[PDB]
PDB file of C-alpha atoms (C1' of nucleotides) and ligand atoms in Angstrom:
ATOM      1  CA  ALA A 840     -50.368  -8.039   6.927  1.00 17.16           C
ATOM      2  CA  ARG A 841     -47.059  -7.023   5.253  1.00 14.00           C
ATOM      3  CA  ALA A 842     -45.108  -3.915   6.502  1.00 13.02           C
ATOM      4  CA  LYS A 843     -44.651  -0.883   4.195  1.00 11.30           C
ATOM      5  CA  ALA A 844     -41.307  -1.010   2.353  1.00  8.94           C
ATOM      6  CA  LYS A 845     -38.518   1.225   3.730  1.00 10.73           C
ATOM      7  CA  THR A 846     -35.395   1.232   1.516  1.00 13.26           C
ATOM      8  CA  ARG A 847     -32.148   0.101   3.221  1.00 13.23           C
ATOM      9  CA  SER A 848     -30.778   3.512   2.127  1.00 11.62           C
ATOM     10  CA  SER A 849     -33.309   5.355   4.258  1.00 12.63           C
ATOM     11  CA  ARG A 850     -32.460   3.141   7.254  1.00 13.25           C
ATOM     12  CA  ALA A 851     -28.733   3.906   6.786  1.00 13.08           C
ATOM     13  CA  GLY A 852     -29.414   7.614   6.237  1.00 10.20           C
ATOM     14  CA  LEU A 853     -27.985   7.449   2.733  1.00 15.79           C
ATOM     15  CA  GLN A 854     -28.877   8.723  -0.704  1.00 15.46           C
ATOM     16  CA  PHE A 855     -26.707   6.102  -2.469  1.00 14.90           C
ATOM     17  CA  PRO A 856     -28.469   2.785  -3.108  1.00 12.83           C
ATOM     18  CA  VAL A 857     -27.539   0.181  -0.470  1.00 13.89           C
ATOM     19  CA  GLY A 858     -29.682  -2.417  -2.148  1.00 13.41           C
ATOM     20  CA  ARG A 859     -28.050  -1.904  -5.550  1.00 12.14           C
ATOM     21  CA  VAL A 860     -24.605  -1.912  -3.952  1.00 16.27           C
ATOM     22  CA  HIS A 861     -25.360  -5.228  -2.261  1.00 17.95           C
ATOM     23  CA  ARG A 862     -26.483  -6.714  -5.576  1.00 15.44           C
ATOM     24  CA  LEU A 863     -23.301  -5.583  -7.397  1.00 12.39           C
ATOM     25  CA  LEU A 864     -21.131  -7.063  -4.645  1.00 11.77           C
ATOM     26  CA  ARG A 865     -23.013 -10.424  -4.817  1.00 15.06           C
ATOM     27  CA  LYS A 866     -22.841 -10.601  -8.619  1.00 11.75           C
ATOM     28  CA  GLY A 867     -19.388  -9.101  -9.039  1.00 14.90           C
ATOM     29  CA  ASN A 868     -17.416 -12.282  -8.178  1.00 19.58           C
ATOM     30  CA  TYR A 869     -15.636 -10.904  -5.103  1.00 18.47           C
ATOM     31  CA  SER A 870     -16.638 -13.441  -2.430  1.00 17.12           C
ATOM     32  CA  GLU A 871     -19.048 -16.314  -1.894  1.00 16.31           C
ATOM     33  CA  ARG A 872     -20.936 -14.308   0.744  1.00 16.06           C
ATOM     34  CA  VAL A 873     -21.546 -10.598   1.443  1.00 15.65           C
ATOM     35  CA  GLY A 874     -22.271  -9.422   5.027  1.00 17.23           C
ATOM     36  CA  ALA A 875     -25.234  -7.105   5.694  1.00 19.03           C
ATOM     37  CA  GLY A 876     -23.191  -4.038   6.679  1.00 18.41           C
ATOM     38  CA  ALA A 877     -20.798  -4.214   3.706  1.00 21.19           C
ATOM     39  CA  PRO A 878     -22.994  -2.446   1.130  1.00 23.43           C
ATOM     40  CA  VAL A 879     -24.133   0.078   3.746  1.00 21.58           C
ATOM     41  CA  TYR A 880     -20.485   0.908   4.473  1.00 18.74           C
ATOM     42  CA  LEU A 881     -19.512   0.960   0.785  1.00 16.73           C
ATOM     43  CA  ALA A 882     -22.505   3.053  -0.368  1.00 15.14           C
ATOM     44  CA  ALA A 883     -21.629   5.502   2.407  1.00 18.15           C
ATOM     45  CA  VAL A 884     -18.005   5.830   1.258  1.00 18.98           C
ATOM     46  CA  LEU A 885     -19.082   6.237  -2.361  1.00 20.05           C
ATOM     47  CA  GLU A 886     -21.536   8.932  -1.243  1.00 20.52           C
ATOM     48  CA  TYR A 887     -18.906  10.753   0.816  1.00 17.81           C
ATOM     49  CA  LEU A 888     -16.331  10.799  -2.040  1.00 17.46           C
ATOM     50  CA  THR A 889     -19.055  11.845  -4.514  1.00 16.45           C
ATOM     51  CA  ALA A 890     -19.990  14.771  -2.192  1.00 17.30           C
ATOM     52  CA  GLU A 891     -16.389  15.831  -1.760  1.00 17.55           C
ATOM     53  CA  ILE A 892     -15.702  16.009  -5.550  1.00 15.93           C
ATOM     54  CA  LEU A 893     -19.044  17.702  -6.165  1.00 16.95           C
ATOM     55  CA  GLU A 894     -18.329  20.307  -3.414  1.00 16.13           C
TER      56      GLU A 894
ATOM     57  C1'  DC B 166      38.308  27.390 -21.353  1.00 15.13           C
ATOM     58  C1'  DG B 167      39.761  28.623 -16.859  1.00 15.67           C
ATOM     59  C1'  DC B 168      39.029  28.697 -12.071  1.00 16.00           C
ATOM     60  C1'  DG B 169      37.912  26.878  -7.294  1.00 12.87           C
ATOM     61  C1'  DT B 170      37.006  22.958  -4.283  1.00 14.15           C
ATOM     62  C1'  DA B 171      33.927  19.005  -3.744  1.00 16.61           C
ATOM     63  C1'  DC B 172      34.633  14.347  -3.744  1.00 15.57           C
ATOM     64  C1'  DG B 173      37.586  10.128  -4.517  1.00 14.68           C
ATOM     65  C1'  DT B 174      41.478   7.627  -2.146  1.00 17.86           C
ATOM     66  C1'  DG B 175      43.967   5.721   1.333  1.00 19.28           C
ATOM     67  C1'  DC B 176      45.393   4.941   5.898  1.00 23.21           C
ATOM     68  C1'  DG B 177      45.079   4.754  10.940  1.00 20.62           C
ATOM     69  C1'  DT B 178      41.624   4.517  14.544  1.00 21.83           C
ATOM     70  C1'  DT B 179      37.240   3.150  16.522  1.00 24.91           C
ATOM     71  C1'  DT B 180      32.841   1.139  16.394  1.00 23.89           C
ATOM     72  C1'  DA B 181      29.415  -2.342  16.624  1.00 22.08           C
ATOM     73  C1'  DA B 182      27.569  -6.181  13.197  1.00 20.96           C
ATOM     74  C1'  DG B 183      27.756 -10.850  12.897  1.00 18.98           C
ATOM     75  C1'  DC B 184      28.046 -15.276  14.756  1.00 16.05           C
ATOM     76  C1'  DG B 185      26.726 -19.510  17.531  1.00 16.96           C
ATOM     77  C1'  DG B 186      24.336 -20.379  21.570  1.00 12.69           C
ATOM     78  C1'  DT B 187      21.267 -20.730  25.473  1.00 13.59           C
ATOM     79  C1'  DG B 188      16.843 -19.451  27.889  1.00 13.98           C
ATOM     80  C1'  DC B 189      12.065 -17.691  28.192  1.00 11.44           C
ATOM     81  C1'  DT B 190       7.444 -17.238  26.759  1.00 13.40           C
ATOM     82  C1'  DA B 191       4.089 -14.431  23.565  1.00 13.82           C
ATOM     83  C1'  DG B 192       1.328 -15.457  20.417  1.00 14.17           C
ATOM     84  C1'  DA B 193       0.703 -17.938  15.994  1.00 15.23           C
ATOM     85  C1'  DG B 194      -2.183 -21.468  14.692  1.00 16.52           C
ATOM     86  C1'  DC B 195      -5.049 -25.454  15.394  1.00 21.25           C
ATOM     87  C1'  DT B 196      -9.413 -28.041  17.150  1.00 20.50           C
ATOM     88  C1'  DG B 197     -14.140 -28.755  18.365  1.00 18.08           C
ATOM     89  C1'  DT B 198     -18.752 -26.679  19.375  1.00 17.10           C
ATOM     90  C1'  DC B 199     -22.647 -23.707  19.023  1.00 19.95           C
ATOM     91  C1'  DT B 200     -25.404 -20.241  16.742  1.00 22.36           C
ATOM     92  C1'  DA B 201     -25.947 -15.813  14.676  1.00 20.53           C
ATOM     93  C1'  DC B 202     -25.999 -14.559  10.279  1.00 20.39           C
ATOM     94  C1'  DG B 203     -26.348 -14.939   5.311  1.00 21.35           C
ATOM     95  C1'  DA B 204     -28.305 -17.521   1.202  1.00 22.57           C
ATOM     96  C1'  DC B 205     -32.342 -18.918  -0.891  1.00 21.56           C
ATOM     97  C1'  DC B 206     -37.256 -18.575  -2.123  1.00 19.50           C
ATOM     98  C1'  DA B 207     -41.740 -16.705  -3.334  1.00 17.26           C
ATOM     99  C1'  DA B 208     -44.977 -12.753  -3.153  1.00 16.80           C
ATOM    100  C1'  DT B 209     -45.500  -8.079  -3.261  1.00 23.72           C
ATOM    101  C1'  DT B 210     -44.909  -3.145  -4.892  1.00 25.03           C
ATOM    102  C1'  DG B 211     -42.375   1.300  -5.244  1.00 25.96           C
ATOM    103  C1'  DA B 212     -37.728   3.054  -6.869  1.00 24.24           C
ATOM    104  C1'  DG B 213     -35.748   4.272 -11.030  1.00 27.10           C
ATOM    105  C1'  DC B 214     -35.906   3.552 -15.845  1.00 27.74           C
ATOM    106  C1'  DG B 215     -37.118   5.131 -20.812  1.00 29.71           C
ATOM    107  C1'  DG B 216     -39.647   8.578 -23.158  1.00 28.52           C
ATOM    108  C1'  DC B 217     -41.118  13.051 -23.808  1.00 30.46           C
ATOM    109  C1'  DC B 218     -41.741  18.313 -23.464  1.00 29.35           C
ATOM    110  C1'  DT B 219     -39.795  23.456 -21.897  1.00 30.14           C
ATOM    111  C1'  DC B 220     -37.328  27.219 -21.398  1.00 29.35           C
ATOM    112  C1'  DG B 221     -33.194  29.185 -19.264  1.00 27.58           C
ATOM    113  C1'  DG B 222     -28.079  28.424 -19.311  1.00 31.32           C
ATOM    114  C1'  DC B 223     -24.642  28.828 -22.329  1.00 33.07           C
ATOM    115  C1'  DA B 224     -22.395  29.347 -26.809  1.00 32.64           C
ATOM    116  C1'  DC B 225     -21.349  32.730 -30.049  1.00 30.28           C
ATOM    117  C1'  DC B 226     -21.398  37.480 -31.653  1.00 32.74           C
ATOM    118  C1'  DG B 227     -19.787  42.352 -31.876  1.00 32.94           C
ATOM    119  C1'  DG B 228     -17.972  46.460 -29.219  1.00 33.00           C
ATOM    120  C1'  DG B 229     -15.512  48.631 -26.095  1.00 33.61           C
ATOM    121  C1'  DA B 230     -12.268  48.516 -22.129  1.00 32.03           C
ATOM    122  C1'  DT B 231      -7.897  47.553 -20.474  1.00 29.92           C
ATOM    123  C1'  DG B 232      -3.705  44.998 -19.713  1.00 27.65           C
ATOM    124  C1'  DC B 233       0.596  44.742 -21.516  1.00 33.32           C
ATOM    125  C1'  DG B 234       4.599  44.057 -24.976  1.00 33.46           C
ATOM    126  C1'  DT B 235       7.799  46.815 -27.740  1.00 33.11           C
ATOM    127  C1'  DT B 236      10.469  50.562 -29.219  1.00 34.64           C
ATOM    128  C1'  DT B 237      12.579  55.159 -28.925  1.00 37.05           C
ATOM    129  C1'  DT B 238      13.864  59.060 -26.431  1.00 36.53           C
ATOM    130  C1'  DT B 239      14.699  60.365 -21.302  1.00 31.84           C
ATOM    131  C1'  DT B 240      16.716  60.277 -16.021  1.00 31.62           C
ATOM    132  C1'  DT B 241      19.255  57.747 -12.629  1.00 31.24           C
ATOM    133  C1'  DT B 242      22.801  54.113 -11.431  1.00 29.91           C
ATOM    134  C1'  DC B 243      26.641  51.770 -10.884  1.00 32.65           C
ATOM    135  C1'  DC B 244      30.808  51.858 -12.280  1.00 32.38           C
ATOM    136  C1'  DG B 245      35.821  52.759 -13.398  1.00 33.77           C
ATOM    137  C1'  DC B 246      39.776  55.010 -14.942  1.00 35.52           C
ATOM    138  C1'  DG B 247      43.746  56.776 -12.568  1.00 35.50           C
ATOM    139  C1'  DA B 248      45.738  60.402  -9.912  1.00 35.53           C
ATOM    140  C1'  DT B 249      45.614  61.314  -4.147  1.00 33.24           C
TER     141       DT B 249
HETATM  142 CA1  LIG C2102     -22.388  10.605   3.527  1.00 33.55          CA
HETATM  143 CA1  LIG C2103     -19.542  17.979   2.498  1.00 35.80          CA
HETATM  144 CA1  LIG C2104     -34.827  11.206 -17.815  1.00 36.12          CA
HETATM  145 CA1  LIG C2105     -26.017  25.928 -28.170  1.00 36.79          CA
HETATM  146 CA1  LIG C2106     -14.622  39.485 -29.557  1.00 36.30          CA
HETATM  147 CL1  LIG C2107     -21.195  -6.990   7.559  1.00 35.10          CL
HETATM  148  K1  LIG C2108       5.104 -18.262  16.588  1.00 37.33           K
HETATM  149  K1  LIG C2109     -21.270 -16.080  14.165  1.00 38.50           K
END
DNA sequence: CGCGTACGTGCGTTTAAGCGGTGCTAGAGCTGTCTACGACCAATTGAGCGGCCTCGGCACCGGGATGCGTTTTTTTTCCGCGAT
């Protein structure tokens, strides 16, 4: 009875991939642990700066 | 190279940094405890990849328009000399 999958991006209201960003943080040798809001925050900042250059 | 004065020098006056010290207490830093949060795992599936087709944006062309650099002949300007 498994719930339909909503991407973490859609929950954060982002177009940039939260889930990918989390996975690059975890595998990029930055810290032993990555908190749940970190990729959400970082994807958001990457999205903002992308928008601003694109505008 | 020649002209004007901005900076270096020195000296006499004035300022406040440095020093050694005491006193007070904010907050750095440490300890132990509890628990929210992240890692890990296994199953499940949809986001995003590689591959493939299409047709309009863009590169490239020639032609014509126009912006502008250059020179020579033309009108205005700013002097510039003394002689007053
Ligand atoms: Ca944004
Ligand atoms: Ca914007
Ligand atoms: Ca593609
Ligand atoms: Ca082409
Ligand atoms: Ca041409
Ligand atoms: Cl976090
Ligand atoms: K202290
Ligand atoms: K905690």
